Swiss-Prot record, chains A, B:
Subunit relationships: Homotetramer.
Known function: Forms oxaloacetate, a four-carbon dicarboxylic acid source for the tricarboxylic acid cycle.
Full protein stretch here: 178 to 530 of 883
The protein's name in its UniProt record: Phosphoenolpyruvate carboxylase
The family this protein is said to belong to: Belongs to the PEPCase type 1 family.
Length: 353, 353, 177
């Protein structure tokens, strides 16, 4: 105790300079590893012991109701320092750190899973080669697969471009699958107690934290989208979006959202601001599905505000449906919120998207 | 002589299989090195000695009136085996071979240019470090620069992607410049005879063959462009280009050629044929300026035939003006040729392009 | 506790084959890291607290009266399997493992020594470059030096011969200093 206190009195550090989004992204990794990593699975064991005690049943293994997300390196509302480059960077770093924490879990598993009793299904899944140390086999495969992707992200972090290894990890399903297979045989083969121990903990952490570690959320003001789309329209000679009434903006937006011909000029010269709005959607689009939890629109006032980001994301090339959320943060916007969403849900195109 | 004849009677090789565009591209490199490499510069010396003898003047050093080009791996008219991938490949290979022949010239120069007498301008150009072996310096720099680009293309030929070295050679100006500097000082400093020897030969070969070795020409039938642009238009719901009369095709083509908004769908699914037409223009566009001499349109019958390739090239992203040439190869097309070009030159847009 | 016991009932391993001197050398590393690594220094703190309490003085920092040695991969009396090759090997492996444990100690030190107040002598020893994070400097230098020798022994363990890095560690004086 005296050592630990002394450390604090003498260990003085004081930022001299403004931290950066990466630094702040790093503090969240520190919270994740010093507390959430153990905390979540314990929360899930207690909750489960209580369900069964008081109600008579335990939630199924596949059900992990908690997920952590971060706005660090994702929120640019009012912050010029959070550039598309920073987000790209932070997106990578999270993946690097998940590899770091997942390796510590996998090592443990590689040594404690010495069980040789396995199921037809599991044996099949390995069939020979490692059919004399089955569970260990699948944990050793994952270990390499994690070590490979780690190596790749430390290069990308460094600024080097080099093709990605065959066993590059991008989705949680890639960690889930093998881990879940071991669990199943251990239960089936009488090793329940071992299955429900550290495997269960890693299982739950995959779905709670997974590949990206902590999904990020992107956030930009509505105004910034209006300017990017205004500069675009004037360049194409179509008109000036930030002058058109709201019915015209929706008209233009629904027409283009349904259009099959692109709109974003291939080699264009926008202004710094607009380019940032455009590059950020390219990061979202470029990033593996499930890295980004949602696009938040601070200062959302009308239905065209939401439709605007769906247009930009479409132009950025995105293959999945990204949750867009208006942020009403004024008395009138709150007051008008309901009106704004009933119009949005009355647009058949929006409703099915 | 008996050895050499015997070789031919016993050295039997017989293709078992149809040669490939790369093979045919290779025979042209064989012609270039076993005969054109020495042949061109000799032709230029004799022509020059004759000008001065009979007329009283020699053409200036900067004037090399001969250039060699090849259709090998460039002509796909009627040939499905000449794919955009092959052309990409052959384009690289030529660069590799020019590096090969240019190194043999540069080695010679690195050892024979031991002159130490140089001009302010040339000394400035090196200024210290190698100011005690000036001409040799500039030839040693070029040697590394060539060796670097060689290394890079042998990787790309192999299918590996890795950033390009700082001294990657892409233009003839990069070989010309230093070489011409040496020539100038040697003339200035009294070493005319040495300047007009192997340096002159390499000088002339740079402009005659240069970086690409032999520029290629691309050739596709007009019909193929009409189909690609027809499939495109139907996908966008605009109409069907291969049904529109010729005045409509030009209308559509001039509108789009002047348009600032793209037309080619970002992630499209065309048919094999169309994709080939589209990918080939991407190679042209992707290739360094001066690699491709012209786009030839076999079976050109109307003004929209020429305008069609200018549209596709525009869509492929090209920064320079590519010479497009109609190929009239039928009695009526020959008969109509003049009419076809007077209309084309009456289009103000075409005339300035 | 139930998890831990279950592990033992189900985690069955049984040598099928005679262990080897390397294996036995490895069990001694396991004893060293799971118990001697913490055990020795604690023994030394308690012994020191007692000296001063009961007698009035503490032994000097430079006096470490305990040393551990092993006969594993060293004893060939009656054992044909302990060849000069094995000993060579085990000698290397120990060095590899010390690098492993010493890195864990050095990492801790690299982060906790953020002190900037230093002596003429110590500042001199770094003089500029890292004279704005002195103790950290010297721990970072050692970190590289350890990482270099680690790299070299993992190659030698592997059977590869390659010259030794400039900061190869061979003596305790190099860590002590
Ligand atoms: Mn706000
Ligand atoms: Mn023909």
């Amino acid at each position: 105790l005296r050592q630990l206190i002394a450390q604090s009195w003498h260990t003085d550090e004081i930022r001299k300079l403004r931290p950066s989004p990466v630094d702040e992204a790093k503090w969240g990794f520190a919270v994740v590893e010093n507390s959430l990593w153990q905390g979540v699975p314990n929360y899930l064991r207690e909750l489960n012991e209580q369900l069964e005690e008081n109600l008579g049943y335990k939630l199924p293994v596949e059900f992990v109701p908690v997920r952590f997300t971060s706005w660090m390196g994702g929120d640019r509302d009012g912050n010029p320092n959070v550039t598309a480059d920073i987000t790209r960077h932070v997106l990578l770093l999270s993946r690097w750190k998940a590899t770091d924490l997942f390796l510590k879990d996998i090592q443990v598993l590689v040594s404690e899973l010495s069980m040789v009793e396995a199921t037809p299904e599991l044996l099949a899944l390995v069939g020979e080669e490692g059919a004399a140390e089955p569970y260990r086999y699948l944990m050793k495969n994952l270990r390499s697969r994690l070590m490979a992707t780690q190596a790749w992200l430390e290069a990308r972090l460094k600024g080097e471009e080099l093709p990605k290894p065959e066993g590059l990890l991008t989705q949680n399903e890639e960690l889930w699958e093998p881990l879940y297979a071991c669990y199943q045989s251990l239960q089936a083969c009488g090793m329940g107690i071992i299955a429900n121990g550290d495997l269960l903990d890693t299982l739950r952490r995959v779905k709670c934290f997974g590949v990206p570690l902590v999904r990020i959320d992107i956030r930009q003001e509505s105004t910034r989208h209006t300017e990017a789309l205004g500069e675009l329209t004037r360049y194409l000679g179509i008109g000036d979006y930030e002058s058109w009434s709201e019915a015209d903006k929706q008209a233009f937006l629904i027409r283009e959202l349904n259009s099959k011909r692109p709109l974003l000029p291939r080699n264009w010269q926008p202004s710094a601001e607009t380019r940032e709005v455009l590059d950020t959607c390219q990061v979202i689009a470029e990033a593996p599905q499930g890295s980004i939890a949602a696009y938040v629109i601070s200062m959302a006032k009308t239905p065209s505000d939401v439709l605007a980001v769906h247009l930009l994301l479409k132009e950025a090339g995105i293959g999945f449906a990204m949750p867009v959320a208006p942020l009403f943060e004024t008395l009138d916007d709150l007051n008008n919120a309901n009106d704004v969403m009933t119009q949005l849900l009355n647009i058949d195109w929006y409703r099915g998207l």
